[PDB]
Design an enzyme around this catalytic site. Sequence first.
Site, short mmCIF file in Angstrom:
data_model
loop_
_atom_site.label_atom_id
_atom_site.label_comp_id
_atom_site.label_asym_id
_atom_site.label_seq_id
_atom_site.Cartn_x
_atom_site.Cartn_y
_atom_site.Cartn_z
N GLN A 18 -23.70 -8.23 -17.32
CA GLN A 18 -22.84 -8.74 -16.15
C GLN A 18 -23.45 -10.12 -15.80
OE1 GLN A 18 -23.11 -8.10 -11.37
NE2 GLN A 18 -21.21 -6.94 -12.42
N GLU B 33 -23.55 -14.76 -4.35
CA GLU B 33 -22.23 -14.63 -4.24
C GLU B 33 -21.55 -14.66 -2.77
OE1 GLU B 33 -20.72 -11.45 -6.58
OE2 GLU B 33 -18.61 -11.80 -5.71
N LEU C 253 -29.91 -18.82 -8.88
CA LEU C 253 -28.71 -18.09 -8.31
C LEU C 253 -28.25 -18.84 -7.05
CD1 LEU C 253 -26.84 -15.77 -8.57
CD2 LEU C 253 -28.34 -14.27 -6.99
N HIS D 153 -26.94 -11.89 -15.41
CA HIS D 153 -27.41 -11.46 -14.41
C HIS D 153 -27.75 -10.15 -14.26
CE1 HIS D 153 -27.88 -11.09 -10.07
NE2 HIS D 153 -26.99 -10.24 -9.66
N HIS E 36 -23.38 -13.36 -13.36
CA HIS E 36 -23.07 -13.74 -12.19
C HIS E 36 -22.19 -15.16 -12.16
CE1 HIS E 36 -23.42 -15.03 -8.07
NE2 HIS E 36 -23.82 -13.92 -7.49
N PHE F 255 -17.54 -9.44 0.41
CA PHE F 255 -18.22 -9.66 -1.11
C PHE F 255 -17.02 -9.66 -2.10
CE2 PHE F 255 -22.47 -10.25 -0.91
CZ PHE F 255 -22.78 -10.60 -2.37
N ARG G 45 -20.53 -4.10 -12.69
CA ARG G 45 -21.04 -3.67 -11.48
C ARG G 45 -20.26 -4.53 -10.39
NH1 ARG G 45 -25.59 -5.96 -8.15
NH2 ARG G 45 -26.25 -7.34 -9.82
N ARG H 234 -17.17 -9.84 -10.47
CA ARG H 234 -17.74 -10.98 -10.94
C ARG H 234 -17.48 -11.08 -12.58
NH1 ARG H 234 -24.18 -9.28 -8.93
NH2 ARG H 234 -23.84 -10.06 -6.95
C1 FAD Z 1 -32.47 -11.44 -10.53
C2 FAD Z 1 -31.33 -11.28 -9.32
C3 FAD Z 1 -30.84 -9.92 -9.16
C4 FAD Z 1 -30.04 -9.62 -7.93
C5 FAD Z 1 -29.97 -10.55 -6.91
C6 FAD Z 1 -30.46 -12.04 -7.22
C7 FAD Z 1 -31.35 -12.21 -8.30
C8 FAD Z 1 -31.70 -13.70 -8.67
N1 FAD Z 1 -29.16 -10.42 -5.77
C9 FAD Z 1 -28.75 -9.22 -5.60
C10 FAD Z 1 -27.83 -8.93 -4.52
O1 FAD Z 1 -27.51 -9.81 -3.50
N2 FAD Z 1 -27.39 -7.73 -4.46
C11 FAD Z 1 -27.43 -6.66 -5.34
O2 FAD Z 1 -27.00 -5.67 -5.04
N3 FAD Z 1 -28.40 -6.89 -6.49
C12 FAD Z 1 -28.93 -8.17 -6.67
N4 FAD Z 1 -29.70 -8.47 -7.56
C13 FAD Z 1 -29.82 -7.39 -8.67
C14 FAD Z 1 -30.87 -6.30 -7.94
O3 FAD Z 1 -31.58 -6.80 -7.00
C15 FAD Z 1 -31.72 -5.70 -8.94
O4 FAD Z 1 -30.86 -5.46 -10.29
C16 FAD Z 1 -32.60 -4.69 -8.87
O5 FAD Z 1 -32.95 -4.77 -7.05
C17 FAD Z 1 -33.74 -4.27 -9.61
O6 FAD Z 1 -34.44 -3.19 -9.05
P1 FAD Z 1 -35.65 -2.43 -10.06
O7 FAD Z 1 -36.76 -1.88 -9.13
O8 FAD Z 1 -35.35 -1.57 -11.06
O9 FAD Z 1 -36.01 -3.65 -10.80
P2 FAD Z 1 -37.53 -4.57 -10.18
O10 FAD Z 1 -37.38 -4.95 -9.10
O11 FAD Z 1 -37.57 -5.66 -11.20
O12 FAD Z 1 -38.70 -3.63 -10.76
C18 FAD Z 1 -39.35 -3.58 -11.77
C19 FAD Z 1 -40.78 -3.26 -11.31
O13 FAD Z 1 -41.47 -2.52 -12.44
C20 FAD Z 1 -42.53 -3.20 -12.63
N5 FAD Z 1 -42.78 -3.20 -14.41
C21 FAD Z 1 -41.86 -3.85 -15.17
N6 FAD Z 1 -42.24 -3.83 -16.26
C22 FAD Z 1 -43.40 -2.74 -16.28
C23 FAD Z 1 -44.29 -2.24 -17.34
N7 FAD Z 1 -44.18 -2.37 -18.83
N8 FAD Z 1 -45.09 -1.36 -16.84
C24 FAD Z 1 -45.31 -1.41 -15.52
N9 FAD Z 1 -44.64 -1.78 -14.61
C25 FAD Z 1 -43.69 -2.57 -14.86
C26 FAD Z 1 -42.32 -4.65 -12.01
O14 FAD Z 1 -43.56 -5.16 -12.03
C27 FAD Z 1 -41.63 -4.33 -10.92
O15 FAD Z 1 -42.46 -3.87 -9.97
#
Ligand code: FAD
Lengths: 59, 44, 285, 98, 43, 599
Positions: free
Chosen positions: F245, F260, F257, F358, F247, F123, F403, F291
């Site tokens: 950041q 990477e 996306l 990203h 991507h 990576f 990151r 990145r």
């Molecule tokens: C966008 C993206 C990110 C990404 C990636 C590819 C894409 C297209 N590939 C990655 C990779 O190969 N390796 C890596 O290490 N990271 C990669 N990323 C980034 C990473 O996946 C993310 O930054 C991270 O996984 C996100 O984690 P988190 O749990 O913090 O974010 P989430 O999964 O979006 O969780 C949000 C949850 O909360 C709920 N939510 C949102 N707003 C509210 C409110 N107001 N009230 C209640 N619940 C809420 C969402 O519904 C979700 O369940």
Amino acid sequence: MRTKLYNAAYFLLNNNESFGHSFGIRLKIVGLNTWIVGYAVSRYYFSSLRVKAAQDERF
Amino acid sequence: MFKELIHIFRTYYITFRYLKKSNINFLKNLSYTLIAYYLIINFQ
Amino acid sequence: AESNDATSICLESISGTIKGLQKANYVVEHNPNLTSEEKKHLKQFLVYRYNPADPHDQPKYVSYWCDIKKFPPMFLDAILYIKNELDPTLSIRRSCREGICGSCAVNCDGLHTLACISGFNRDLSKPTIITPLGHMFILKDLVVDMTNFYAQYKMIEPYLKRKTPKPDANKEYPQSPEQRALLDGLYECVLCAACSTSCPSYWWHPDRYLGPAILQQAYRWIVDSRDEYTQERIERIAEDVRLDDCQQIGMCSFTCPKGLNPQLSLKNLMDMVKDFRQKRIEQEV
Amino acid sequence: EFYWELKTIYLELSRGVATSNFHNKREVTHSIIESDIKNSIHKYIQLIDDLKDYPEWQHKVREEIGYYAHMIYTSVNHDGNFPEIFKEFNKVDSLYYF
Amino acid sequence: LPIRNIQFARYHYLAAVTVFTYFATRCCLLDYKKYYPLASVKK
Amino acid sequence: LTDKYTVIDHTYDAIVVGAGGAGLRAAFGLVEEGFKTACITKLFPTRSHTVAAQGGINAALGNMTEDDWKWHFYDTVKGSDWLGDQDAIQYMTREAPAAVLELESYGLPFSRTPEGKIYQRAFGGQSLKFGKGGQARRTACAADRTGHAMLHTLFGRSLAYNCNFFIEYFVIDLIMDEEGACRGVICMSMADGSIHRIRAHYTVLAAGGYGRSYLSCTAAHTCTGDGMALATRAGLPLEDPEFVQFHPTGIYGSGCLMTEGCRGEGGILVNSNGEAFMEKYAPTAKDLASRDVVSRAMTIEILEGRGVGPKKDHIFLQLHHLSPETLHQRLPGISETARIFAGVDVTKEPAPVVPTVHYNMGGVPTNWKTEVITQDKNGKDKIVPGLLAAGENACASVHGANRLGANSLLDIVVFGRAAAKLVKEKLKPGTPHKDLPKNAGEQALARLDKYRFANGEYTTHHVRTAMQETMQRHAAVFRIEKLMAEGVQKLDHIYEQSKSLKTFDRGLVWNTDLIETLELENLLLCSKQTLLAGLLRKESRGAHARDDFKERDDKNWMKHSLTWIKDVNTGKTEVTYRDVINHTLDSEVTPVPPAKRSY
Ligand SMILES: *Cc1cc2c(cc1C)nc1c(=O)[nH]c(=O)nc-1n2C[C@H](O)[C@H](O)[C@H](O)COP(=O)(O)OP(=O)(O)OC[C@H]1O[C@@H](n2cnc3c(N)ncnc32)[C@H](O)[C@@H]1O
Ligand SMILES: CCCCCCCCCCCCCCCCCC(=O)OC[C@H](COP(=O)([O-])OCC(O)COP(=O)([O-])OC[C@@H](COC(=O)CCCCCCCCCCCCCCCCC)OC(=O)CCCCCCCCCCCCCCCCC)OC(=O)CCCCCCCCCCCCCCCCC
Ligand SMILES: CCCCCCCCCCCCCCCCCC(=O)OC[C@H](COP(=O)([O-])OCC(O)COP(=O)([O-])OC[C@@H](COC(=O)CCCCCCCCCCCCCCCCC)OC(=O)CCCCCCCCCCCCCCCCC)OC(=O)CCCCCCCCCCCCCCCCC
Ligand SMILES: CCCCCCCCCCCCCCCCCC(=O)OC[C@H](COP(=O)([O-])OCC(O)COP(=O)([O-])OC[C@@H](COC(=O)CCCCCCCCCCCCCCCCC)OC(=O)CCCCCCCCCCCCCCCCC)OC(=O)CCCCCCCCCCCCCCCCC
Ligand SMILES: CCCCCCCCCCCCCCCCCC(=O)OC[C@H](COP(=O)([O-])OCC[N+](C)(C)C)OC(=O)CCCCCCCCCCCCCCCCC
Ligand SMILES: COC1=C(OC)C(=O)C(C/C=C(\C)CC/C=C(\C)CC/C=C(\C)CC/C=C(\C)CC/C=C(\C)CC/C=C(\C)CC/C=C(\C)CCC=C(C)C)=C(C)C1=O
Ligand SMILES: CCCCCCCCCCCCCCCCCC(=O)OC[C@H](COP(=O)(O)OCCN)OC(=O)CCCCCCCCCCCCCCCCC
Ligand SMILES: CCCCCCCCCCCCCCCCCC(=O)OC[C@H](COP(=O)(O)OCCN)OC(=O)CCCCCCCCCCCCCCCCC
Ligand code: SF4
Ligand code: F3S
Ligand code: FES
Ligand SMILES: [Ca+2]
Ligand SMILES: [Ca+2]
């Protein structure tokens, strides 16, 4: 409480070859069994009929 | 065969869902008895 | 104070059925003030609208004429253009935008599919109809009640259960590339329910019969080499018509936008259930 | 038999919302079935409480009987008397069936 | 696994089905009263 | 009054606001610890942005090549550009192998090496022997859909226990008392508009980032930074919001996306001339550079006139060099996505790519045990009672100024488990609750009603589009003081507009318009803080690069920038600073001195 409703899928799905192919076999078997049972019922019904009576006869 | 007829009626008729497997089995037993009686009697 | 209403309800039901058959596919123009000349340049979307929260609302198609040269060519893009530009009260689920979350599954013009990765007929003459998943209760517009789908998903215990302790605890459950590729094309399901909403057996018996997707997940957890509850899972899915109700229609593999083949997985599950039933007798003797 | 009581209630609702039901289509749930639902859910909650010493039995009773309670929950809109009818169900069971 | 006299069972079931269908439908014992108008006569 | 809204009160030992990887991990970890836990999410867990993650989970398993977690720590520190807390990085790196092995134990399907061990691939930004050991293959990836498999495995384990999920509940605000403690949460049921005041001791605030604040962003439509906005509206600070950041690879004109890991399999970056140019910008690691540096190189090549495609606006990601078997075995999903969103067959054609917003290194600050912290009026930081940020929403500083890549899932898992462990450490299951404050949710309902019946002059979409355009134009890869000041003025004007929004739906059942309006408010707060923090920092560090100050100044600007939005109605932003941590959790690994290379 207003009961919920839905749109039956078969009313809004484009006709597909899988539906046709499978329901064709199902309808074949349904037709076979229905034909057999209906023939039995028809024989029973026609044999149940009364004998012809005279003209303007009471009892 | 009988199993298949019951399965079709259960899957297509919503009302038929009311019957238990026990009632279905009772119908099965009665139907088998009637079939045996029919076979025997027709030859008498 | 209330009285018997069997007769009134019966008459109203019959009359309403007849009228609806006469007036099926009711349509209301979003913007009636459109010259027919203008409509030559704009494509027509018939979007299903229904707000059960409002007691005065009833289901209806709404006609939107849009310029398809203003947004990318996908069902979700058109829906969001309509929402943002024309009428922002439209309701739909959308998270991923790249066909991964699986939230946007809808009846995109006669076929259940994800709206984000599905194009629409570019021709300006034939209208496009967007409606929610068929046999799912409608909450609002294109949002259905998928709660039962999740509840069924919970009943298969989709978590790795193992009856043998790990030998050393500093390693990973061994699994050769073959025992991994055995899962390829089987763990990619996004639980969109597009397939299961197209299965007639699932139309007739939503509760007693698990959908094609859930059964495919059970198959995924069965064929997995690391889990040791193979026979237990087989027996659990062998109850009543949780699996026996499948009639191998094959529409499940045809609709799957991900390209998966739930029909083959269900066929293998049926074979394994049959073998389980036979060898419960053959082996224990 | 209690399970079949709940399933009878659900079957009545399903026949109500069936597509073939062109003759007995009702927009608004009537009071009798609402009372039946309320009392059935009350009895179900009491049963769950009575099985606090048997976690396996309690879990099975939930997974089996409460399934149709959840389907009944999904069959109707959240208006009218809905908050009162499913008051007990909304505590724990509703969250389980999501 | 082995089933004693399985072939006998298959043939017995087939015979039972055939006899029951024969008597219920009377497939072989038709009625010809409907053909009498469409038949020639002798003597 | 606002009593017309139905209100229902619950009581739990712990709450988890979010259902991503971090949310589910924390929830079922708490359930394991024996606490009556609840999880609140506006989406069904399996539809959170974690599902879309493609690259692998970064960990120091010695399968493909000899690795030592100290090397991973050094790579993380260098990649962070010496702005990330050393202690948190050490903890995450040390726990990574155990975390990945536990994930596998749950049943996560990982690509298998012929011997049967978990597979790993190179990576961007990895190395061995403290940077001098060449490329490092430590990213354990489950094909090209690692996020999907990881999230589904976590959700299955969650179902194994009883987590009392609140599916599709939108969290409006945090119930905080006058002592600064987070009493609980106030959320709404999108199904029927019921309002729930969930009382609890600890509230794991892990709700993703605000990638949707920009025009072109790979973030999901639901990544509106609610987690970072609840804290801001509660008066808590936001840390490092200026660092965003980009991507390096993202399908042009769509925002999707390109993993990477593809560039780790042998992909190439090509300008119109038809050459790999990353050597001039990264002579050592070539394509597999950090990145930020790759994105800056791509932006420079674009601005140098060597735009690959029509109107010279993007760069060619070549992948047809690899064998079709390799593409179909390791990069199936991205191949299909390229076929769909670009109409370009990866096997024999080059994809179009451009750096895209990203990740948000910013978030609610914490210490390293996943406890929110806030500067006391003296200037010293104190722990906010009963509040444990985690996941991308938490600026634990483990990512610092850039990151490393593929470390986000590792951070998620490790820090969710850490938050559960901390709750176990401090709280006891059998602790009675004290009553909620007198004014439990007056302001939350006030805002909800204000946005619900708004009849202003500007539509939500118009304001959101204006904000996104402003952020895209003024908070792009390169920043400059005049442009950032113009952007700040534009954002102030947009915020003024937002007080007079118009909404067209007055209903409650699945009123998506109201949800989007609330998310617009959250994104406005986050955008204002981000732009101001970027404006103040006069240096070029990590992903924050400025044309006016091209040299990073460790003498003055080696400090996290905290942002405050007090009196939301006023909408005036202040900024203070919090010094970085240079002490490791132990003497096992010596803290890395600030170098002068960054590749
Ligand atoms: C966008 C993206 C990110 C990404 C990636 C590819 C894409 C297209 N590939 C990655 C990779 O190969 N390796 C890596 O290490 N990271 C990669 N990323 C980034 C990473 O996946 C993310 O930054 C991270 O996984 C996100 O984690 P988190 O749990 O913090 O974010 P989430 O999964 O979006 O969780 C949000 C949850 O909360 C709920 N939510 C949102 N707003 C509210 C409110 N107001 N009230 C209640 N619940 C809420 C969402 O519904 C979700 O369940
Ligand atoms: C929508 C409205 C519809 C309204 C419909 C109204 C219909 C009114 C019917 C009235 C009664 C007609 C009876 C005909 C009897 C025929 C036999 C006969 O002459 O027997 C002499 C009869 C003595 O009978 P018998 O000899 O003892 O035994 C007779 C048996 O049939 C045994 O005789 P057999 O051994 O010679 O049998 C021959 C053999 C022959 O069998 C075969 O070999 C089968 C061959 C089939 C060939 C078909 C070819 C078709 C081609 C298709 C091509 C498709 C191509 C597609 C391509 C697509 C593109 C690729 O078996 C059969 O015929 C099979 C019969 C069993 C039927 C099974 C199905 C039953 C259920 C379904 C019924 C239909 C439902 C339709 C629903 C529609 C909904 C929209 O005595 C008489 O002289 C009576 C004459 C008939 C008059 C009787 C009057 C009774 C009045 C009662 C009072 C109430 C009346 C109410 C009237 C209401 C009107 C609206
Ligand atoms: C001549 C010799 C004597 C003949 C008569 C012998 C009678 C023996 C006793 C029969 C006892 C039957 C009742 C007990 C069985 C179980 C019933 C049950 O489920 O109870 C609850 C269930 C009611 O459930 P529900 O909750 O009220 O309904 C909502 C559920 O979603 C519904 O969910 P579901 O799926 O459970 O509901 C389906 C339901 C069906 O119920 C429905 O949901 C709808 C029923 C009405 C449908 C009408 C047609 C709709 C439009 C279709 C298109 C037609 C096009 C025609 C024109 C074509 C032009 C080309 O299915 C059944 O009823 C199952 C058994 C059906 C066959 C046995 C009965 C045959 C009666 C034949 C005579 C009828 C009276 C004369 C009519 C003609 C006068 C000129 O059934 C009833 O209570 C009604 C029973 C049936 C009443 C008669 C309706 C007309 C049926 C005509 C069938 C014709 C078949 C062709 C051969 C006919 C040869 C004679
Ligand atoms: C209050 C109580 C509760 C009431 C509830 C309501 C309902 C009433 C319940 C009452 C209880 C009894 C019900 C009847 C039995 C039901 C059985 C049943 O459902 O089984 C299903 C069950 C279905 O199983 P499956 O898996 O589907 O397989 C069936 C297959 O067919 C597989 O079949 P398989 O292969 O195993 O074969 C079966 C076997 C069964 O057969 C036997 O072994 C039995 C033999 C007959 C014994 C008869 C004993 C009768 C004794 C009566 C004594 C007096 C009673 C007086 C009582 C008065 C009151 C106190 O067949 C044979 O043995 C085949 C023989 C073929 C002979 C061929 C001859 C060849 C001649 C040529 C030789 C070679 C010549 C060469 C020349 C070469 C020249 C070149 O059947 C069986 O498996 C058992 C076999 C079938 C037995 C049927 C028996 C029927 C009896 C009806 C009696 C009715 C009496 C009414 C009296 C009324 C008085 C007023
Ligand atoms: C002596 C009496 C004789 C009378 C003859 C009457 C014939 C009746 C034939 C009925 C055919 C089958 C449909 C009705 C029964 C369905 C039973 C069932 O299980 O269905 C349940 C299901 C509906 O239920 P569902 O879809 O909700 O499924 C159940 C799902 N849960 C459990 C979740 C609720 O299927 C249907 O009812 C489908 C109805 C389709 C209706 C099609 C109508 C076509 C009309 C064509 C008219 C053509 C006119 C041409 C004129 C030309 C002029 C020139
Ligand atoms: C197999 O698994 C499956 C299922 O089960 C789980 C499904 O549910 C399904 C979906 C199921 C559904 C949609 C069921 C609901 C819909 C239904 C029942 C609609 C279909 C209704 C029917 C079939 C019944 C009505 C039809 C009839 C009564 C047929 C009547 C036919 C007649 C009168 C014959 C007409 C033709 C003629 C008379 C021939 C004329 C010409 C000639 C004689 C030629 C001239 C000859 C000479 C000699 C000169 C599928 C697809 C499936 O695959
Ligand atoms: C597919 C699913 C369904 C399957 C169903 C299967 C059913 C199987 C039934 C098995 C039993 C069969 C019994 C048959 C009895 C037939 C009796 C009959 O009607 O025969 C005809 C009879 C006249 O016959 P006959 O006197 O012999 O004269 C001719 C002699 N050459 O005629 C008469 O004498 C006429 C008077 C008697 C008949 C009266 C009928 C009244 C019907 C009332 C209907 C009410 C409901 C209306 C609903 C609609 C309302 C809008
Ligand atoms: C909405 C509408 C709803 C409508 C719902 C209606 C539901 C109705 C359900 C009941 C009716 C079902 C009818 C099924 C068709 C009849 C089939 C038949 O005749 O056989 C019945 C049964 C065997 O058939 P089955 O059990 O179905 O299949 C077994 C497959 N291994 O046979 C039996 O088991 C009967 C017992 C005897 C079996 C044969 C025994 C061997 C034969 C030789 C006997 C020799 C005796 C001694 C010697 C005599 C000769 C010398
Ligand atoms: S089975 Fe197919 S249609 Fe259903 S969720 Fe899985 S991939 Fe999607
Ligand atoms: S579409 Fe339907 S019933 Fe069986 S195999 Fe495929 S599921
Ligand atoms: S919109 Fe993301 S998968 Fe449907
Ligand atoms: Ca197994
Ligand atoms: Ca962060």
